[PDB]
Amino acid sequence: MYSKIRIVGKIDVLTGLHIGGIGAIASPVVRDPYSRLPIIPGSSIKGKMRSLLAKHIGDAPEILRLFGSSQKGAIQSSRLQISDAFFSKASQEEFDKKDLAYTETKFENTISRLTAVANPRQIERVTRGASFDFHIIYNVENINEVMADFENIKTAIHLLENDYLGGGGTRGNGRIRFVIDSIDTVVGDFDSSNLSIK
Amino acid sequence: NKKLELMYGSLLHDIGKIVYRSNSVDFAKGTHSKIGSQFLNKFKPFQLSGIVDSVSYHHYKELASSSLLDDSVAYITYIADNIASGFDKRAPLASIFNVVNSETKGLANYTYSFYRYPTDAKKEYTSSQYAALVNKMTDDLSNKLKVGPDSFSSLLQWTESLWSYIPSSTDTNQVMDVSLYDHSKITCAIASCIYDYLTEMNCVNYRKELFSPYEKTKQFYQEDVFLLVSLDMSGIQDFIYNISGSKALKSLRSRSFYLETMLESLVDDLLSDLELSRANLLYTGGGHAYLLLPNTERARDVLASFEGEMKEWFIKIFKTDLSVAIAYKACTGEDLMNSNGTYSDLWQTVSRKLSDKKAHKYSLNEIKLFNSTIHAGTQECKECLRSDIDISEDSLCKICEGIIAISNDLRDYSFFVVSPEGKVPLPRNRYLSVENQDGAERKIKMNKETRIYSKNQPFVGKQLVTNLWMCDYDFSTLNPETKKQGIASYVNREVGIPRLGVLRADIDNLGTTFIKGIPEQYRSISRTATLSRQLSMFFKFELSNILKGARISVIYSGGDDLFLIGAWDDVISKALVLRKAFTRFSAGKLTFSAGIGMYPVKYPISKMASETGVLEDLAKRGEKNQVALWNDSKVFGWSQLEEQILKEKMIPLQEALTNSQEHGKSFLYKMLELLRNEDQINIARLAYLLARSSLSEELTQSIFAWSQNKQQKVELITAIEYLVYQIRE
Amino acid sequence: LVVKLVKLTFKSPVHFGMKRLSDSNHTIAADTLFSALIIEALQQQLELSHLLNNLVITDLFPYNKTSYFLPKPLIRIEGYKAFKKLTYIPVENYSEYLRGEIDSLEASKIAESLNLGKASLSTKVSLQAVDHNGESEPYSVGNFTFYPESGLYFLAKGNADTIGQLEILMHALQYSGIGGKRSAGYGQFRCTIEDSGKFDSLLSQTGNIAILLSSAMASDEELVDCLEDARYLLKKRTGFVQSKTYADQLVKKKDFYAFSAGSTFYQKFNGKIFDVSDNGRHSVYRYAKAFWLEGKI
Numbered sequence A: 001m002y003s004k005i006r007i008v009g010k011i012d013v014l015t016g017l018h019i020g021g022i023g024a025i026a027s028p029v030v031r032d033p034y035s036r037l038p039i040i041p042g043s044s045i046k047g048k049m050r051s052l053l054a055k056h057i058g059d060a061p062e063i064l065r066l067f068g069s070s071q072k073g074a075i076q077s078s079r080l081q082i083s084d085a086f087f088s089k090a091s092q093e094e095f096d097k098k099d100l101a102y103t104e105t106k107f108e109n110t111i112s113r114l115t116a117v118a119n120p121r122q123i124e125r126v127t128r129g130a131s132f133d134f135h136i137i138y139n140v141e142n143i144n145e146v147m148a149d150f151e152n153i154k155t156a157i158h159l160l161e162n163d164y165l166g167g168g169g170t171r172g173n174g175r176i177r178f179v180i181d182s183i184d185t186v187v188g189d190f191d192s193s194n195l196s197i198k
Numbered sequence B: 001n002k003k004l005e006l007m008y009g010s011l012l013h014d015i016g017k018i019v020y021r022s023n024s025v026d027f028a029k030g031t032h033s034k035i036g037s038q039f040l041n042k043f044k045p046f047q048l049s050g051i052v053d054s055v056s057y058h059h060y061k062e063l064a065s066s067s068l069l070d071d072s073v074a075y076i077t078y079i080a081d082n083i084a085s086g087f088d089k090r091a092p093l094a095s096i097f098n099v100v101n102s103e104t105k106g107l108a109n110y111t112y113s114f115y116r117y118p119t120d121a122k123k124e125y126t127s128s129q130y131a132a133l134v135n136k137m138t139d140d141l142s143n144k145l146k147v148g149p150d151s152f153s154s155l156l157q158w159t160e161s162l163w164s165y166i167p168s169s170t171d172t173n174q175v176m177d178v179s180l181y182d183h184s185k186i187t188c189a190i191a192s193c194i195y196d197y198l199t200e201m202n203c204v205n206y207r208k209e210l211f212s213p214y215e216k217t218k219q220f221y222q223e224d225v226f227l228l229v230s231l232d233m234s235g236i237q238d239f240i241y242n243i244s245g246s247k248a249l250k251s252l253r254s255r256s257f258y259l260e261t262m263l264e265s266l267v268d269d270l271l272s273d274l275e276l277s278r279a280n281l282l283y284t285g286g287g288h289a290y291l292l293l294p295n296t297e298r299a300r301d302v303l304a305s306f307e308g309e310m311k312e313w314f315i316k317i318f319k320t321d322l323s324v325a326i327a328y329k330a331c332t333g334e335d336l337m338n339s340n341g342t343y344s345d346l347w348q349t350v351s352r353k354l355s356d357k358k359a360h361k362y363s364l365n366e367i368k369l370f371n372s373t374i375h376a377g378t379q380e381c382k383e384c385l386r387s388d389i390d391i392s393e394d395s396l397c398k399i400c401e402g403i404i405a406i407s408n409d410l411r412d413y414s415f416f417v418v419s420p421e422g423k424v425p426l427p428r429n430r431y432l433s434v435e436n437q438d439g440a441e442r443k444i445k446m447n448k449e450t451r452i453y454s455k456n457q458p459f460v461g462k463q464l465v466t467n468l469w470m471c472d473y474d475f476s477t478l479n480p481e482t483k484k485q486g487i488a489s490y491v492n493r494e495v496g497i498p499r500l501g502v503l504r505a506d507i508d509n510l511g512t513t514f515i516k517g518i519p520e521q522y523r524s525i526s527r528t529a530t531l532s533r534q535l536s537m538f539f540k541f542e543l544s545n546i547l548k549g550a551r552i553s554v555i556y557s558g559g560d561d562l563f564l565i566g567a568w569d570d571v572i573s574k575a576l577v578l579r580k581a582f583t584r585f586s587a588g589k590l591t592f593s594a595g596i597g598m599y600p601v602k603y604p605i606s607k608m609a610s611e612t613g614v615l616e617d618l619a620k621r622g623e624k625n626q627v628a629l630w631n632d633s634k635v636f637g638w639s640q641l642e643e644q645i646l647k648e649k650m651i652p653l654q655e656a657l658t659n660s661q662e663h664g665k666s667f668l669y670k671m672l673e674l675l676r677n678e679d680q681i682n683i684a685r686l687a688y689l690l691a692r693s694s695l696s697e698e699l700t701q702s703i704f705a706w707s708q709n710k711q712q713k714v715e716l717i718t719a720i721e722y723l724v725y726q727i728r729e
Numbered sequence C: 001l002v003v004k005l006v007k008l009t010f011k012s013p014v015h016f017g018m019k020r021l022s023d024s025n026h027t028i029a030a031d032t033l034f035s036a037l038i039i040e041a042l043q044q045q046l047e048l049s050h051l052l053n054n055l056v057i058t059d060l061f062p063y064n065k066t067s068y069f070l071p072k073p074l075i076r077i078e079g080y081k082a083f084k085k086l087t088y089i090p091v092e093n094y095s096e097y098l099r100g101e102i103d104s105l106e107a108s109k110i111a112e113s114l115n116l117g118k119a120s121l122s123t124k125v126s127l128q129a130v131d132h133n134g135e136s137e138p139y140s141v142g143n144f145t146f147y148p149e150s151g152l153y154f155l156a157k158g159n160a161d162t163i164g165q166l167e168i169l170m171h172a173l174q175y176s177g178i179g180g181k182r183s184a185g186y187g188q189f190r191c192t193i194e195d196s197g198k199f200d201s202l203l204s205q206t207g208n209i210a211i212l213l214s215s216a217m218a219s220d221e222e223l224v225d226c227l228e229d230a231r232y233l234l235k236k237r238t239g240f241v242q243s244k245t246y247a248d249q250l251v252k253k254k255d256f257y258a259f260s261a262g263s264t265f266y267q268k269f270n271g272k273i274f275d276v277s278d279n280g281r282h283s284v285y286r287y288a289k290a291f292w293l294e295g296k297i
């Protein structure tokens, strides 16, 4: 019957990740309201994977059935339920040692073409050593489309590793690397021993 | 027209006090009542028998040798004075707050001078000032005033314009907080009720019923003669603030104004069915209205039919979005004078009956018809999100389309005419539109039973307008370029963060102030009604003067609460100005707490009001005299925010950083990072940061001292954050 | 019937909307949870007879460490703004509240002692138009982040097979998530189903007054005898139909007005699974059965 596959792992930051939104910060990152820990929103992961998969495929039926659709006539439930990637406990303890802040302020400027004057800017970024526990649920609505969809998920994740997550990652930011801790079918009889990401 | 004569006679019954204080012309040494008869007899329209006898014979000694027609309404005025009221010629009007909360905060001596603020400075009303008042009364009565069934409403406002700061009592033994307008209005309110009550019993001869043995004067106070009626609108917060769309910001003021005029319309419907003037309307504030009605069977039948009818209309137009609950309790004369000590109990029981009405809001048929829906909407309005009502193009419900149409007219015009044809629906198959003076005059000429309301207007010539005190402050309407974008123009700044600020004020323990603040000896219907009017006139009228020159739009003031949207710093600055002015107005004795929010343009309107309402709730925790600024962590006192956060900490930082070539914004951010953590090392890093910050040496020691002590570092953080927002290119 | 307590501890922020995406509510009525269970049952190819005919659930209610919060009874209190602003009363203090014995200070303390989460508003963008020569659409999603020891709970009445089916459905609902943005990371939770000990004591008591625990509504016949001297709160249960099968385009359900949890009635009424669809391909069920917790006033 219906199956749900729980992909859980780590999003290791490879370069300072800034997904824009405690006090006054110049371009602050998005944080958990309670713990005040920087987070990677699931809508940001979902949007970036959808954007990269849309470019790879070419909305397409493969993207619509994977990230959801609401168009007239063809309303497709989103199979990918990408939860918010919260700052891991392991990286919290690892950053507590070295007394390293979870986020760092990156200082830049913009040298004007007309006047050759540098106008400074600051964007807060999650520090490189950070790791976020990502929790994705894939709803197996079709037992025949699961292998093709998980191929697409691997392609979108591979593109995301070669790209940046939220922020001005064209200028360096946002680079990430996924690690899969386990892929276990929490609900249903479907098996995911053969299934894998990356 | 004996009812009309009594209404004119009770309102002008103590007019002789003003003339006697002036002692200008023909001072025949007589009683203020005799002076009032002499003054009013100078004008032919007011020379009616009922009015003159009421003015001249409203006391015991006058009525003992009255020799009247035994049915004249001077007896009714005499009872109305005794209920309302129950020497120094030149005495000021003592502020009502001299008595408010006197058990806790002591007794004050604040008095008014000839909106106005009490000063507490010993002063007297010069008899030449009283002479000028008498001259102006003569001009108004002779030319701009007339006696007629539809012209008393203008007379009641005329008394409001002049006598609102004249003391009603000048006996030095008893304090004088009741103004002449308040005592005359309460006298007319009670006299109207007593006249109806005596008519219901069909008592032909008034004197033995009321005054003759003097023992039935006490007995009449024991009779259940009046009704304390409270009608309270529900769902106002969800109606006005829970809206969406880009037009929500522009239409926010119109939604709140619509509920103000609807509540006024509801009251004027209740009073028109009872043939009573606005004098019986004790108060009308935030969705609330207290009235004093006769205990006649006719009045109870009117109330029952009015309550059932307004339920039918509110369901017809708004279903469950808006509703009105009406509760009434029979009260005696001794209830209003607080002779037995049951005055506060009367108000508590009326509100208790109101809360019981609010619980069981709907009946069997109304609930079933709510769940008897034939067709799903499959289309909704952008703002009201209502699908049951017919939605036209632009995806707007009929009500909100009218609300938007009321906008771009509320700013320009000052007359709200309730008429058969209009923009937004109103009860009794009428509609509300905002028109100019010419447009309103057209509308009232076309079709009768049409009401016209004037907003914050000084008294004018004879007309059927009703004066509505409404806070319509809107800085955008001053400049035509900013008038196009009402509140979103405050986002436009040359320097500073563009974010808007939302201020939600609310007086602390106002209900406890009315019930317990007034001591037993000073509690009465007249003393309470004065307190309601001073508080109402502060919010409705004085708020506009307080926020003058600031980029602030007043969504609502109304009695107890407040809602303003404007520039984030202007809202904070005028919150402190308003807090200081509120302390002067109330002379202490009353504190209000406020939440202040920092929300950008295009921020959800519902979230702007809800999150600031949460902040006000945080400021309502504890001793309640606090302001919750931005985050829930900055719940400061009013003195603490004004003095410690801003003047003591933020101003030194701004001046120091301006003196340098660059306005900080890099030392400030680094200061905040080192202030966010509790590490011992971050204190040392802060010391190094201040040393290299290249500002004055005594300031670095001050900043280091501030960061050391808790409840003083949070003030420093708020000072830095305010400064950072002040400088954002 | 048997009463099992289901405790929902939420991993991520949840978006419970009243009428807008920007709204961030801390709870969902029984109609919202029941529709989640029906959606889960139809996905797992389960039968709907047990949910529709025998299951009596209650509103998801706040719970924090060493306390379980029940809705404020709409009883007459024989400082009155403390009870007006009060929303949830702990179970250990619930029997007291009905009898009285609660001052304005105590009610104010109770409201502040609710350590259920913290609401917020995340702002996101829609770069769909950006590719097509347009501009990003910044939209706000209001979410609620529960505290580490906090969450929502609800009690379930049913037979052995009805409860057993709900154990399966709640296990599958852990990964579907409850809320409004569950496909965008908002609503994941883990639920434990345990026999309630303290709640069975509270449900065993029999007072003169009856207190609603779920968003309920009496049928026409039952509304005749139950509305007398009732103190309630009609809530407009609205929304859009969430289904790929109901229609080609998303349409709103018929407006349904149901009594809020905590409404006190002197006559108990069994609710109904009302149908709020309009000529759709399937019948949309809005749960309005009544979970009654009697009390002594």
Ligand SMILES: Nc1ncnc2c1ncn2[C@@H]1O[C@H](COP(=O)(O)OP(=O)(O)NP(=O)(O)O)[C@@H](O)[C@H]1O
Pocket: B232, B233, B234, B235, B236, B237, B238, B240, B255, B256, B257, B259, B260, B285, B286, B287, B358, B555, B556, B558, B561, B562, B563
């Ligand atoms: N025209 C208005 N514009 C804005 N705010 C208003 C207006 N009238 C009243 N208010 C405020 O909103 C409140 C009324 O909102 P409402 O939804 O009736 O809540 P309530 O006062 O708790 N009454 P109820 O819902 O019956 O329990 C008033 O007490 C004021 O604070």
Ligand SMILES: [Mn+2]
Pocket: B506, B507, B508, B509, B510, B511, B560
């Ligand atoms: Mn108040």
Ligand SMILES: [Mn+2]
Pocket: B506, B507, B560, B561
């Ligand atoms: Mn208020």
